[PDB]
Structure formats: structure tokens, C-alpha cells
């Protein structure tokens, strides 16, 4: 009593207007506040404006109530129990290696590049300048060649 291929295909072809299901078990990165830069899995929904987010202790960020007004969550998801506590929280996360599949998206790659570019020292800043100098030299010579 099931419909198979059409059920599989038209759902993918639906192209819904909103995404990133807010089901408990997601992950998140706060956008405003002292925690803007720390990761937290999503726990449940307490009210329309407040939610609860909680990073894995490997990330090292606690179970906390935050308004939905400050949020830009993650697309991943784990399958914990509703009463899953922080003995299974540290297991469900390394069971799937949930974080790794986000820092290969465009925003995550951009964030990592920006972070390490900020952490760059003066010598590697000069190395970047020198590499761009050589690259520009090569751009110019082969642009003259292309004629």
C-alpha cells in the first residue's frame, strides 16, 4: 500500500520555500550575543520566541535557553532520545561525526578561511602579498600571450 518512485521523486522536485527543519537534534551557531562563535545542538522548542540549544562537550558549550531571534542553526541532525542526557550526548555526536559535513559547505569554508586569515601573523601576511605578486606577474604575462 505504497507508491514508490513517484513518492520518492516528486518530494525531491517539490522545491519547498523553507528548509532546515527545526526538529530537535540539529546543530547551530549563534548569531548575536556572547556565544556568537560557539556551536550548540538543538534540544526542544519551549515557546515561539525561545528555544534550547546545546553543543557537544567536544565542542564544549552548554545546554542553554536562547531566543530564536539570535539564531542561525545547522542543517545536520542526530537521533537522540527525548530524554537523552549528557552521557549519550557525547556518544551520539562522535557516532556520526556530525560537524565535519558542514565545514565543506560554502558558508563554513568562508568562515574557516576568515578565521585563519584573522589569525594570520605578519610574516604570512607578507607571504600572501608575495604569492599574490607572483600570481599577478603570471596573470599579466599570459594575458599578454593570449593575444
Amino acid at each position: 500500500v505504497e507508491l514508490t518512485e513517484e513518492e520518492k521523486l516528486y518530494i525531491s522536485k517539490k522545491n519547498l520555500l523553507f528548509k532546515r527543519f527545526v526538529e530537535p537534534g540539529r546543530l547551530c551557531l549563534i548569531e548575536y550575543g556572547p556565544y556568537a562563535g560557539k556551536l550548540c545542538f538543538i534540544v526542544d522548542i519551549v515557546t515561539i520566541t525561545r528555544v534550547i540549544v546545546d553543543g557537544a562537550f567536544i565542542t564544549g558549550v552548554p545546554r542553554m535557553v536562547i531566543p530564536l531571534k539570535r539564531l542561525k542553526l545547522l542543517k545536520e541532525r542526530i537521533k537522540i532520545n527525548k530524554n537523552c542526557k549528557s552521557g549519550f550526548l557525547r556518544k551520539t555526536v562522535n557516532s556520526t561525526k556530525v560537524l565535519e559535513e558542514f565545514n565543506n559547505s560554502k558558508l563554513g569554508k568562508k568562515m574557516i578561511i576568515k578565521k585563519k586569515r584573522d589569525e594570520a601573523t605578519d610574516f604570512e601576511r607578507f607571504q600572501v602579498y608575495f604569492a599574490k605578486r607572483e600570481l599577478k606577474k603570471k596573470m599579466t604575462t599570459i594575458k599578454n600571450k593570449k593575444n
Binding site: 604569492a131 603570471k138 596573470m139
Partner: protein, 201 residues
């Protein structure tokens, strides 16, 4: 604040918020050129703002309306007067700040191809509930006697066509510059290659 001058696209911008930001910038000393002032939005119904402007219009010096408040129905002049109302124009410094502002309808000649900036703190899409009523400064000016709205629109569409063509050329130039980067990279020495990759270049 630290530029020679800032060109601001006033389309979809709330009048008072835009005027306050511009006035503070002018007082701090940044020259501002406001373009497309006829697309400024004002919260509240068009009839509401029409009533407000008629209340302003019925206001004049009884003895001699020549001395009375000039009404300046062009939308650019409306934005200019709103900005002037938010700075101390009676003082020398305030007068300098006021004169450091240029307002235009549409985009005149030396603003076709300088970057137009936007103040998100004054955008309608971020400052007004979608279910709430707003008006358009060009329409309000046309209702109170500006009668140059259509000509500005027809000039704007020609500008749109010119910009469309030149952006279409620019994207081809940019993607050619990108595809020459690809083999400018792998011909470069590995120690510079690795630095460029790991620093996102």
C-alpha cells in the same frame, strides 16, 4: 565617514531614518550624494502623507507668503528639507553640513558608474511590517504637484538598459579574468600555491 563622498541609493528607504543617518554623517563631515530620491518610501498611507503635506501647504506667512515656508515639492528637495530639519542649520557648522549634501531624482551623469550604497537600518523591508501601509515619495510629490515623475521613470529605464548591457560585459570580463587565474595558479611555484590555497585566494 572616511570616504571622499558616499553615493546613497534612496530607493526603498524610509525617509526619516534615512534623513537621520545622512544628517549625522554630514555633521561628522562626510559628503553625501543621495540619488533616486523619488523612490523614497514613507510609512503610513499615501492618503495620510497627502494630508500631512496639505497641512504643510496651507501654512504660510499671512502678511507676505513670499517670506513664508517654501514648499519645495520635488522629492529630492523634500529629502533635503527633512535632513536640514535634523541638523543645526542656523549655525556656521550646521550650514556647512547642510551644504555638504547633494540630492537628485534619478541618477545624473557622474553617478551612473560610482558605487551606490544602501543603509540597511533604514530599508523598508527591514523596518516595516509587511502588512502595514506605506507610500512612495515620487507618488506623493506627483499628487502635491511635482508632475516630473513620468520623465524620471523614462530616464531611469534607459539607465537600466545601459547598466544591463555594461554589467553583461563586465561579467564576461570577470569570468575571463577568473579562467586565466586557473592556469596562472598551477604554473606558480608550489610554496606560493599552498599559501594562496590555505588563505582562501
Amino acid at each position: 565617514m572616511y570616504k571622499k563622498e558616499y553615493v546613497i541609493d534612496c530607493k526603498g528607504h524610509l525617509l526619516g531614518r534615512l534623513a537621520s543617518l545622512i544628517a549625522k554623517e554630514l555633521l561628522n563631515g562626510q559628503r553625501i550624494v543621495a540619488v533616486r530620491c523619488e523612490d523614497i518610501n514613507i510609512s503610513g498611507s499615501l492618503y495620510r502623507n497627502k494630508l500631512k503635506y496639505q497641512e504643510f501647504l496651507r501654512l504660510r506667512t499671512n502678511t507676505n507668503p513670499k517670506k513664508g515656508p517654501l514648499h519645495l515639492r520635488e522629492p529630492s528637495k523634500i529629502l533635503w528639507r527633512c535632513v536640514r530639519g535634523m541638523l543645526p542649520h542656523k549655525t556656521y557648522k550646521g550650514q556647512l553640513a547642510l551644504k555638504k549634501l547633494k540630492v537628485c531624482v534619478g541618477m545624473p551623469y557622474p553617478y551612473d558608474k560610482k558605487k551606490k550604497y544602501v543603509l540597511p537600518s533604514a530599508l523598508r523591508a527591514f523596518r516595516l511590517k509587511k502588512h502595514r501601509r506605506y507610500c512612495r515619495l515620487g507618488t506623493l510629490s506627483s499628487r502635491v504637484g511635482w508632475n516630473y515623475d513620468t520623465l524620471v521613470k523614462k530616464n531611469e529605464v534607459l539607465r537600466k538598459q545601459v547598466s544591463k548591457a555594461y554589467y553583461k560585459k563586465k561579467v564576461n570580463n570577470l569570468n575571463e579574468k577568473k579562467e586565466i587565474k586557473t592556469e596562472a595558479l598551477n604554473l606558480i611555484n608550489p610554496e606560493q600555491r599552498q599559501v594562496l590555497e590555505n588563505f582562501g585566494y
